[PDB]
């Protein structure tokens, strides 16, 4: 609901301050992005994002992110790209990784 704010007191958590209706509005669940922004009367109207698009934090952005295209060959996905997470590629099955990177490392090695 469009909770009317009062100067000297901030909005509660899970509520942002729209600067078009000048009134506090709610923040909806991760994995769904605001299709129609908050207005004086209407609250946030947010719709789930499409495939390979996620949002891990309570958002109001009009567009989600994008996961990786593919893990190519000999790389099993260790975490599927659902609505609240990424596509973390990793090493080959039956091997391990000795290097490191942001998500999937740069040098594998046999399981010894």
């Amino acid at each position, epitope marked *: 609901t469009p909770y009317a704010p009062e100067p000297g007191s901030t909005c509660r958590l899970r509520e942002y301050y729209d600067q078009t209706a000048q009134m506090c509005c709610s923040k909806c669940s991760p994995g769904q992005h605001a299709k129609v922004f908050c207005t004086k009367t209407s609250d946030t109207v947010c719709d789930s994002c499409e495939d390979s698009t996620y949002t891990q934090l309570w958002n109001w952005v009009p567009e989600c992110l994008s996961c990786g295209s593919r893990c*190519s*060959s*000999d*790389q099993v996905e260790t975490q599927a790209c659902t609505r609240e997470q990424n596509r973390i590629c990793t*090493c*080959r099955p039956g091997w391990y*990784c000795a*290097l*490191s*990177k942001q998500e*999937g*490392c*740069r*040098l*594998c*090695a*046999p399981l010894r």
Partner: antibody
Amino acid sequence: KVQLQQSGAELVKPGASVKLSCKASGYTFTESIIHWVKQRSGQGLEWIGWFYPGSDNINYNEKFKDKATLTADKSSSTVYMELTRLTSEDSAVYFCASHEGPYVYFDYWGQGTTLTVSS
Amino acid sequence: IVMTQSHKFMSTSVGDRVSITCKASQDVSTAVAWYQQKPGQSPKLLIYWTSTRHTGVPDRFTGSGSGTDYTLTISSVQAEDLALYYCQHHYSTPYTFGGGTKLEIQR
């Protein structure tokens, strides 16, 4: 797209130290691993350890443990290979190469330098 | 670990098929890469994973084999197949290549 560039050519004497420079261009440097290989006259290629600069992971081949020293400064995206005790057997082409996937297949082959050792 | 080829001087012609071999020293499973090394220039990448054709190289450079015996082949050998092909593995810390099996065309 990734390019690796070395120097033109050098010449040293038995008991010297020339520094081979490999400059990467096209991608970042915090994420660009570098391997060094030596092609002698006629025989097959060899391999030397890697110098992942972002995590500063340094690995060396057993044979070339005490000949090559790897160091880099993250100000020009270059990797320097310092050679020691250069006998007459080190007169060979030197390549610096890197891979793309996490397996290590050399797809980015830098131009080879033509180091020769003589008095 | 050491990776060694068998013959050094495959001799062939236009239209024949070459069978450059490569035999590891251990059970190297399915890890090998093939390089073409036209003298003067720098090595190129032909094959990896013993059967995966790298982007760009022609379809005739098909890899084959499995386990410990690997075999490049060219079924339509043209003039520009004159180089020193090498094979490599991806397991130990000391990566090792072999000798240079040099093709040579007769006319």
